[PDB]
Amino acid sequence: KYFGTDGVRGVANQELTPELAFKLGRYGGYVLAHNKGEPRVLVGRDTRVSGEMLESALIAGLISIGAEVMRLGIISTPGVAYLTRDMGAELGVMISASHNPVADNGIKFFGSDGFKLSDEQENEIEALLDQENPELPRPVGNDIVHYSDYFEGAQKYLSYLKSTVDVNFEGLKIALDGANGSTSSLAPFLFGDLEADTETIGCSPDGYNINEKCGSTHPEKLAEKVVETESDFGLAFDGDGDRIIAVDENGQIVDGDQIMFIIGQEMHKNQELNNDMIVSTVMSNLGFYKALEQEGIKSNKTKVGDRYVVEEMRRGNYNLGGEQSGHIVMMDYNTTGDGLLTGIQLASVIKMTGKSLSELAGQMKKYPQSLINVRVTDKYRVEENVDVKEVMTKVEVEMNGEGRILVRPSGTEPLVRVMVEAATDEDAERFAQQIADVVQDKMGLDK
Amino acid sequence: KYFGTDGVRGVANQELTPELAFKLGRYGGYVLAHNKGEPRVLVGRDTRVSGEMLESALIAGLISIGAEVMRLGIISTPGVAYLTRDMGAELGVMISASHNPVADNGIKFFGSDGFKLSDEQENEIEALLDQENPELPRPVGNDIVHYSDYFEGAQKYLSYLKSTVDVNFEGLKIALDGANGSTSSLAPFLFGDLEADTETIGCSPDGYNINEKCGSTHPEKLAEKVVETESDFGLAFDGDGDRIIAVDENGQIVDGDQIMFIIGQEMHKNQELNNDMIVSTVMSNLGFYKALEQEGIKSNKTKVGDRYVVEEMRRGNYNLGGEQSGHIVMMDYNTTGDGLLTGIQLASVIKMTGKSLSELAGQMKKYPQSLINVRVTDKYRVEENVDVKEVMTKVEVEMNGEGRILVRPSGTEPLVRVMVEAATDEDAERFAQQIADVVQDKMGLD
């Protein structure tokens, strides 16, 4: 299967080749081009050098079927999602591998509604990939259209982001890390235009340095800068700009759960939070759930992955959801995780309250976590297994209520993931080992 | 066999697909550009839509191989050839189909020396196209290079063209037809910068109007303009600007043969002509050859085609050669047929003498041409046939000096081309039909 969890990803020029990018543009176009005359498609990318070669290969595929291609250049993945629906386009494509290093690259698609592709269409694309020679339209002469360069899209996206906040950031000092990625050209202008004084790092891309000791994945240098410049707070983005991780005034790190809590707290007070609930994955820390209970906010847990958070939010029409990693979705403004949008909305809360990030983030304490992997036969049996159930109960019994345990299998791998959250590092490691031991003896294929 | 007479030509997205353009960039790049670590290749195109689509596919092939691509945008084919030599670039690529209509497009390659590919280089590329899975370099990470835009090149090409002339064009009013091609943005500036007054048509390309009722192939619209604007003369260009056709004061057409004669005449007296000779194809009219006898110029005849003209020019190092179609090569300045260069050099001769085109064109008379194609059973028996030999032999005797018949079979298709050039139309058809009648009786179809 070419399509993975989040589009088609591989190492650029061997696993993900220009020939594949051409096929994805031609086939992906036709699947999305059987429903409109003279299809309009927009394509964006991040700062990887391999994006230039893949884009030209992809654009050739889109043109070869008759589409009107609109090159956005360097833009964040949410920018593609927003522009696609706002311009009424049939499809949007983002070329990026997010946090992965420069060698890797990927191709992501967006529908006319700003959402990821439907699986029936994803499979139809793959069915065309299976055919050695599929007959397809071959427009000639006047039937081919001129593509256009839509340099306006980046600022049109930025102006929309500016519209969401209702106050400027004067009096705030903010440090930004663009991860040498698509945000490098967007975050300095966006916050600078809102009157915030800015200190920047990771905003000098060269085509090979994306996500190199910078970004949401590596926030240390940012925390170093925030303390050095005595800034009020700092924000770190990833290569394609769908995730954000924050740093407070003292250099402590604020994860997605805390950011989700701060923003959901303010939405709750203003009664803009839909159904007084926040969607999230179970991987979020226990302290996050208890803080939501204190604030009277119902919590909904879903399986790990962007697919399921957004899936759940659409089903019930919830306006806020996200993951601990920093991938946070605000339905009222965008249809996918947007680090830039989440960043300004966080800064808005800091401006209105007159507080600091450490105080707003300090509202919830994160319990220590211990994680263990056990290579088992058949992953469904684990929680049906009697011995596994009983030790979990004992562990559950021993913690009066101060902690929780999670036993989940990973779809990518053939092993189970033992997650324990407890009051103390030593407790968390101990309950995890007790549970992992029981699984290892009775479920360890790879004993 | 993908390669034709002038590179790979076909209808864009049907005969030649972006998939093919990708392979030509990937395979052609490896074969022709790899004697340096990060080869530098230059890419240009004309105004046709699909030039955008084929370019992106080609550039992907070049990058996937490790090349440093430098886009030139819209430029004439000689511009690519000239720039490739001046920049020390490993290879140059031009995306165009020349005079052909908008639907067609093509890919032509240039070596570091500014010359088209050798048949050996042509053969090697086709072998890679045939291989099911050839293992070629696949650079990853830092190994891939950034492509770049060299739009500055177009003005450097124009400044170089200005350098070739030693005098201005003040006092001249010139009409230009750009064929909605690459010359559309270059010829008005080039002649205007030389102080000539300009009236232009066919300089409004929209991607679908190239070579549409204008250009070297269609000079009727320009000749109309020359008379109406009361201009001294007019110049017509093709889609990719490797050909030139001129129009006199009265609207008559001046072909490549006459343009070659005018330019070679001035070179000869000034002794700029190397070995006092001009290279040309057999397709050239006899009046061109007779005028060369009146002057002190020798002449070499070669097989039809751009390649063979320049090939002969390199072997003996002659500086002037061309075709009747308007594809003319000036070795001292460029390595391929350049319509813009020839346009300046033609006008340059006019200003120095102070004469007009009609007087310069009248130096040679064009004998009327009659062309007939006959379906045959085969051609390799047609030259041997006695009845054909007998009518042709009778023809050689009847015209002691009246002209010449040329009989040339096509390997491509099973017909014989019967061409006769004679003093009067009435003579030629007496020879053209008589010969074609004899050929028709013997082969083709019972």
Q: What does the domain layout of chain A look like in residue ranges?
A: 1-153, 154-253+338-367, 254-337, 368-447
Residue among A91, A122, A83, A78 nearest A330 (CA): A78
Roughly how many angstroms between the first and final C-alpha of chain B, as a whole number? Answer: 33
**What is the spatial distance between Cα B200 and Cα B344, in angstroms, rounded to a whole number?**
16
In whole angstroms, how far apart are CA A115 and each of A3, A108, A111, B188? 16, 11, 5, 50
Residue of A52, A60, A208 lying closest to B53 (CB–CB): A60
DSSP state of A281: E
**What is the spatial distance between Cα A26 and Cα A63, in angstroms, rounded to a whole number?**
8
Instruction: Give the DSSP H or E segment for B320.
Output: strand B320-322
Between vectors from CA A202 to CA A199 and to CA A204, what angle results, nearest 5°? Answer: 105
DSSP state of A105: E
Interface of A with B in 104-163 (CB under 8 A): 138-142, 144-147
Q: Which amino acid is present at A337?
A: G
**What is the spatial distance between Cα A304 and Cα A374, in angstroms, rounded to a whole number?**
19
In whole angstroms, how far apart are CA B157 and each of A91, B79, B163, B187? 41, 6, 10, 12
Residue of B11, B12, B60 lying closest to A53 (CB–CB): B60
Q: In the beta sheet, which residues pair with residue B302?
A: B281
Overall resolution, Å: 3.0
**What is the spatial distance between Cα B82 and Cα A118, in angstroms, rounded to a whole number?**
51
**What is the spatial distance between Cα B338 and Cα B320, in angstroms, rounded to a whole number?**
12
Contacts of A49 in chain B (CB under 8 A): 144-146
DSSP state of B277: E
Give Cβ neighbours of residue A78 (< 8 Å, ≥ 6 apart): A157, A241, A242, A334, A336, A337, A338, A339, A340, A341
Quickly list H helices, B165-305: 187-193, 220-228, 256-269, 286-294
Contact A146/B22, CB-based, under 8 Å? no
**What is the spatial distance between Cα A226 and Cα A235, in angstroms, rounded to a whole number?**
9
Q: Which residues of A are annotated as a binding site?
A: 98, 238, 240, 242
Structure tokens at A277: 């609930």
Roughly how many angstroms between the first and final C-alpha of chain A, as a whole number? Answer: 30
Instruction: Tell whether domain B368-446 is in CATH 3.30.310.50.
Output: yes
Q: Which amino acid is present at A131?
A: Q
State phi, psi for A94 to the nearest 5 degrees: -120, 125
* Burial class of A227 by CB neighbour count within 10 A (0 to 12, 13 to 18, 19+): middle
Q: State the method.
A: X-ray
Class of domain A154-253+338-367 as given by CATH: alpha beta
In whole angstroms, how far apart are CA A68 and each of A89, B91, B209? 10, 31, 19
Distance from CA of B140 to the nearest CA of A (A): 6
SS3 of A47-60: the string is CCCHHHHHHHHHHH
CATH homologous superfamily for the domain B254-337:
Alpha-D-Glucose-1,6-Bisphosphate, subunit A, domain 3 (3.40.120.10)
By the 8 A CB rule, do A322 and A102 touch? no
Instruction: Give the DSSP H or E segment for B177.
Output: strand B173-177
Which string of b and e fits B3-34 if b means at least 16 CB within 10 Å? beebbbbbbbbebbbbbbbbbbbbbbbbbbbb
Contacts of B46 in chain A (CB under 8 A): none
Q: Which residues of A are annotated as a binding site for Mg(2+)?
A: 98, 238, 240, 242
Instruction: Give the DSSP H or E segment for B427.
Output: helix B425-442
Contact B18/A61, CB-based, under 8 Å? yes
In whole angstroms, how far apart are CA B344 and each of A346, B76, B187, B351? 66, 15, 10, 10
> Can you say whether the dihedral through the CA atoms of B394, B400, B402, B404 is positive or negative?
positive
Residue among A230, A223, A158 nearest A194 (CA): A158
In whole angstroms, how far apart are CA A357 and each of A231, A233, A350, B259, B367? 11, 7, 7, 80, 92
> Can you say whether the dihedral through the CA atoms of A226, A232, A238, A243 is positive or negative?
positive
**What is the spatial distance between Cα B57 and Cα B39, in angstroms, rounded to a whole number?**
18
* Burial class of A405 by CB neighbour count within 10 A (0 to 12, 13 to 18, 19+): buried
Number of C-beta neighbours around residue B181 at 10 A: 34
Instruction: Give the DSSP H or E segment for B106.
Output: strand B104-111
Residue among B209, B242, B229, B254 nearest B349 (CA): B254
Looking only at the bridges linking them, the beta strands covering A298-302 and A277-281 are parallel
Contact A139/B13, CB-based, under 8 Å? yes
Q: Which of B50, B64, B96, B98 is catalytic?
A: B98
Is residue B209 less than 8 Å (CB to CB) from chain A? no
Contacts of A141 in chain B (CB under 8 A): 102-103, 208
**What is the spatial distance between Cα A39 and Cα A88, in angstroms, rounded to a whole number?**
11
Residue among A23, A106, A101, A12 nearest B138 (CA): A12
Structure tokens at A337: 């995780």
**What is the spatial distance between Cα B268 and Cα B342, in angstroms, rounded to a whole number?**
16
By the 8 A CB rule, do B255 and B324 touch? yes
Residue of A11, A63, A138 lying closest to B14 (CB–CB): A138
Smallest CA–CA distance from B57 into chain A, residue: A57
Residue among B293, B289, B331 nearest B309 (CA): B331
Number of residues that this document lists for chain A: 447
Q: Which CATH number fits domain A1-153: 3.40.1110.10, 3.40.120.10, 2.40.30.170, 3.50.50.60?
A: 3.40.120.10
Give Cβ neighbours of residue A352 (< 8 Å, ≥ 6 apart): A167, A266
Between vectors from CA A239 to CA A233 and to CA A244, what angle results, nearest 5°? Answer: 35
* Burial class of A118 by CB neighbour count within 10 A (0 to 12, 13 to 18, 19+): exposed
Residue of A56, A64, A207 lying closest to B146 (CB–CB): A207
Number of C-beta neighbours around residue B173 at 10 A: 16
**What is the spatial distance between Cα B347 and Cα B198, in angstroms, rounded to a whole number?**
13
DSSP A326-349: S-EEETTT-SS--HHHHHHHHHHH
Catalytic, A98? Answer yes
Looking only at the bridges linking them, the beta strands covering B320-322 and B328-330 are antiparallel
Torsion of the alpha carbons at B237, B239, B241 and B245, rounded to the nearest 10: -20
**What is the spatial distance between Cα A386 and Cα A287, in angstroms, rounded to a whole number?**
29
Give Cβ neighbours of residue A218 (< 8 Å, ≥ 6 apart): A211
Residue of B56, B138, B207 lying closest to A13 (CB–CB): B138
Q: How far from chain centre, in Å, is Cα B231?
A: 26
In the block, residue with structure tokens 């991780």? A245
* Burial class of B258 by CB neighbour count within 10 A (0 to 12, 13 to 18, 19+): buried
**What is the spatial distance between Cα B272 and Cα B268, in angstroms, rounded to a whole number?**
6
A·B CB contacts under 8 A:
98
DSSP state of B368: P
Q: Which of A50, A64, A96, A98 is catalytic?
A: A98
Structure tokens at A169: 């950031």
For residue B350, the SS3 value is helix
> Is B306 annotated for ligand binding?
no
Looking only at the bridges linking them, the beta strands covering A320-322 and A277-281 are parallel
Structure tokens at A426: 């030593």
Contact B147/A52, CB-based, under 8 Å? yes
Is residue B304 less than 8 Å (CB to CB) from chain A? no
User: Can A154-253+338-367 and A368-447 be said to share one CATH topology?
Assistant: no
By the 8 A CB rule, do B235 and B214 touch? no
Ramachandran class of A55: left when φ > 0, alpha when ψ lies in -120 to 50, beta otherwise: alpha
**What is the spatial distance between Cα A39 and Cα A25, in angstroms, rounded to a whole number?**
12
For residue A69, the SS3 value is strand
In the block, residue with structure tokens 């208890």? A290
Fold of the domain built from segment(s) A368-447: TATA-Binding Protein (3.30.310)
| Sheet hosting strand B233-237, strand order edge to edge | B197-201, B173-177, B233-237, B244-247, B253-254
Quickly list H helices, B138-281: 153-164, 187-193, 220-228, 256-269
Contact A144/B13, CB-based, under 8 Å? yes
Number of C-beta neighbours around residue B166 at 10 A: 7
Give Cβ neighbours of residue B249 (< 8 Å, ≥ 6 apart): B226, B232, B233, B356, B357, B358
Number of C-beta neighbours around residue A188 at 10 A: 16
By the 8 A CB rule, do B96 and B105 touch? yes
